Design a protein around this ligand. Sequence first.
Ligand SMILES: OC[C@H]1O[C@@H](O)[C@H](O)[C@@H](O)[C@@H]1O
Ligand SMILES: C[As](C)(=O)[O-]
Length: 445
Amino acid sequence: IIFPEDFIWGAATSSYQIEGAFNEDGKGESIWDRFSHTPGKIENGDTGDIACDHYHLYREDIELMKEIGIRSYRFSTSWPRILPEGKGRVNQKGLDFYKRLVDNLLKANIRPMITLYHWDLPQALQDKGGWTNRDTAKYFAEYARLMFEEFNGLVDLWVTHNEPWVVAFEGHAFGNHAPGTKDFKTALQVAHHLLLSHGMAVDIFREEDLPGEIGITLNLTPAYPAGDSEKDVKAASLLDDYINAWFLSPVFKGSYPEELHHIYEQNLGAFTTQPGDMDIISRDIDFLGINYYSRMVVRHKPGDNLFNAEVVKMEDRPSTEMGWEIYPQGLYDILVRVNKEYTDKPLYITENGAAFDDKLTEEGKIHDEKRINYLGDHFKQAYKALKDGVPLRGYYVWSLMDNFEWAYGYSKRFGLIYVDYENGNRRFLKDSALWYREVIEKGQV
Ligand SMILES: OC[C@H]1O[C@@H](O)[C@H](O)[C@@H](O)[C@@H]1O
Ligand SMILES: C[As](C)(=O)[O-]
């Protein structure tokens, strides 16, 4: 098992999950500032106020990146740190932080990949309806243009959006994520505008003529029938469209999946679109980012919901601390399917990783063998996909460091690096980081 010597091994983070400095240097409020400061939304009342304090500690963090030897670092930029009101006047100190960060990465021979939207919408824009207001799509594109202009010739890997399914449905249907709305109709309208805003930024990227590549990042969860039933097969197919095709088809085919679109429209009524929207959404892009963690096993169940389907708990299979099934085969299956059905463009795994109950020992080590076994098994499936002709160019581990795991707060640790929050926010390389270091040196698992 040996990867190409130029294969792009990396690690990933996001702004709200690591930066801290939540109201420092003119930064505006985000929907995740607001949400986490709302009682009962986050486990243990955790907030991202300080988190890993990467905003002040980023130089030390880049030293640790160099120790592991990652070739690329995927991070997101905070829209409200740069444009506090979401539009209007740039906050120069906020922008200067990312200019310093990128200069330091380039000096370290670490190739940056910027995610423009990793969920921290300006609260100023949420007060005008957030993603149900089509203007939010326009202002996102304007923010994209600013960033393209400022990092022309410095950043050549760009992702518009991280996981629009999650933003739409966890954020607005089930209310587990900011802004915390619980209305499925709103979630559909949101999804459309996220997709729209993506295409709008792609158009601007081409016009600005920067050197480099632009794409989008989707969480993809492959679905499997619980049984041989032709009804279990249709059920899994529908849930596969719910999560995956709902965003894959618009981006690569210029249409929503037909049956599911019908089902939604019949029960909820139509969400608002303008003519030509599917043309914008489906602009040609340069790569697809895939975030993969697990699968879903699905059985038919007429009653409970709109898809007449429920997900089966695989209780006799190993799982992570999140309760997610460990299922490395799913990473191969989804890479192969995307390449077969949707696109021949380069693919990146922009996230894969796992939470386990990490214990810091009585001097500074973390023996997270479960994480080593998890990543190893998934690296092997990526290799198999490669060998079978999938144009996989890179693999980013989630995460470079322990961080704020959204509604779970700091209770869930995904890092290669342990963050000892209470003790000066000090960092410790886990065994999995030492392991990943060996993999990258050799290009061999
Ligand atoms: O759940 C762990 C990670 O999963 C991915 O889907 C998200 O993009 C990350 O922000 C998240 O922390
Ligand atoms: C992606 As098209 C040309 O069918 O709108």
